[PDB]
Amino acid sequence: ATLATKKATLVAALKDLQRVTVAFSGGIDSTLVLKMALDVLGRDNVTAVVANSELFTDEEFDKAMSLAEELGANVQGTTLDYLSDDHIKNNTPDSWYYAKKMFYSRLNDIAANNGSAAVLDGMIKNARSEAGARSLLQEADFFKTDVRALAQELGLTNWNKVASCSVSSRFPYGTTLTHDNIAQVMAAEKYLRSLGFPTVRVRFHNDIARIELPEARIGDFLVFNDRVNRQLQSLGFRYVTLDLGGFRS
């Protein structure tokens, strides 16, 4: 009921596992799991693994890696190659499930090799089980309130403040993903973010880019129409369009 009880539940679970591998994204939840794993088991009994793949930017990978080092963890990157999977390459609605399966399977191979007793992720009370990953925060009945509370108790102040999605969301279901069109959309969103628009999606429709921006920024945005049009055309789109519905129509 109290936070002190739930933290104690989490300290006891970590002591029992003795040695863990942590699925680390840089968000506040995995930051709390990793910091508690370090404080309870020590640096040499924790391995933080950050996933690098073609579906996420190298920028999020470098930031997640540097966050783990700043907490004082041994951090190890692993590269997954999600497009080896037919369900991800053709982006079926079931893609998410197979993506998680490939993710958790690699962490069990890593955890097996380093002698950990379990793989931990950051999920809270509101294919992980198929691979046997442990969600200690959810087992100790943490809610988002309890994460912020115990993060403040531990002096954690730095974490990825916006948790991303995979670039597959920029493609309609059934569209085949390639290393090129993925690079195309990610270059396009990175360029838009460089003009000062941190929240943006460049949705992919073959020869059409359909830009989603938050509606409150559209007025500030017209000064960039022509540069955005020309820049995304050089990236391979034949038309660059602004979606009148805005961000997530």
Where does this chain bind a second copy (CB under 8 A)?
1-4, 66, 69-72, 145-146, 148-149, 151-158, 195-197, 203, 205, 208, 210-211, 214-229, 239-246, 249
User: Contact at 8 Å (CB) between 204 and 184?
Assistant: yes
Q: How far is the CB of 160 from Ni ion (least distance, A)?
A: 22
Task: Pick between residue 109 and residue 220 the one whose CB is nearest to Ni ion.
Answer: 220
Token pair 């920029």 is found at 170
Residues 2-61 touching Ni ion, rule: CB under 5 A, are none
The entry of Ni ion, a second copy, none near residue 101 (CB within 5 to 8 angstroms by kind) is: none
Q: Cα–Cα distance between 116 and 47 in angstroms, integer?
A: 9
Q: Which two tokens stand for residue 223?
A: 């000064």
Nearer to Ni ion, 71 or 192 (CB): 192
Residue 94 tokens, joined: 């079931």
Q: Which is nearer to Ni ion, 156 or 187 (CB)?
A: 187
Interatomic CA distance for residues 136 and 133, integer angstroms: 9
Residue whose CB is less far from a second copy, 110 or 149 = 149
The stretches of 92-212 forming alpha helices (DSSP H) are 95-114, 136-139, 144-153, 179-194
Q: Which does 174 bind (CB under 5 to 8 A by kind): a second copy, Ni ion, none?
A: none
Single out the catalytic residue among 8, 117, 165, 222.
165
| Chain CA centroid to CA 242, Å | 26
Question: 2, 91, 127, 106: which is closest to 47 by C-alpha?
Answer: 106
| Least distance from a second copy to the Cβ atom of residue 184, Å | 16
- Asked if residue 48 lies in contact with residue 22, where contact means CB atoms within 8 angstroms, the answer is yes
124 is catalytic: no
Closer to Ni ion by Cβ: residue 59 or 220: 220
Please list the residues that pair with 205 across neighbouring strands: 208
Q: Cβ of residue 197: shortest distance to Ni ion, in angstroms?
A: 11
CB of 76 to Ni ion, least distance (A): 22
Decide if 26 contacts 67 (C-beta within 8 A).
yes
Interface residue with Ni ion among 112, 220, 233, 239 (CB under 5 A) is 220
Bridge partners (DSSP) listed for residue 46: 20
At closest approach, how far in Å is the CB of 157 from a second copy? 5
d(CA 102, CA 140): 26
Region near Ni ion per CB under 5 A, out of 40-48, 115-123, 212-220, 225-233: 212-220
Q: Which residues are catalytic?
A: 165
Which residues contact Ni ion by CB under 5 A? 220
